[PDB]
Amino acid sequence: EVQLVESGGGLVQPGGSLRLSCAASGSVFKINVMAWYRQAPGKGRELVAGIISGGSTSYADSVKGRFTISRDNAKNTLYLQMNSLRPEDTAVYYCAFITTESDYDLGRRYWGQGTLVTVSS
């Protein structure tokens, strides 16, 4: 089993910046996916940004050009750099990892607990 610990959330002014981190511990084998999700009232849960093993990244239309996903492969840590934050970015942000021990297994998804980011004055 794998545990994900998130940090870096809180209250920021519109136009502001925040960096989230997501550190993995436990029995980490092959990481297939590292991704950020967010939940807000009336918006369900949305994939914000992801990195697939290979380096191929993806972003929600709403955050393209403002958010950057990165990872420290050596430390199994996932980052989200947020710039030019807008009130509509207010949400609980989650990280998820998919891990596998071989191509013959279906993989397992592990979740961070979530961290609130509030963009208001």
Numbering used by the authors: 1 to 121
Passage from the reporting paper:
VHHs have typically similar structural characteristics to those of human VH domains, consisting of four framework regions (FR1/2/3/4) surrounding three complementarity determining regions (CDR1/2/3). To be employed in human therapy, VHHs from camelid origin should be subjected to humanization processes to minimize their potential immunogenicity, similarly to other conventional antibodies employed in therapeutics. In this study, we investigated the impact of CDR‐Grafting using a humanized VHH of therapeutic interest on the affinity for the antigen, its thermal stability, and its structures.
We selected a humanized VHH, Vobarilizumab, as a model VHH containing a humanized VHH framework. Vobarilizumab, binding interleukin‐6 receptor (IL‐6R), was developed by Ablynx for the treatment of autoimmune diseases and confirmed its low immunogenicity through clinical trials. To gain insight into the molecular basis by which CDR‐Grafting diminished functional and physicochemical properties of the chimeric VHH, we determined the crystal structures of 7D12‐Vob and Vobarilizumab in the unbound state. In wild‐type 7D12 the identity of the residue at position 106 is Ala, whereas in Vobarilizumab it is Phe, a residue with a bulky and hydrophobic sidechain.
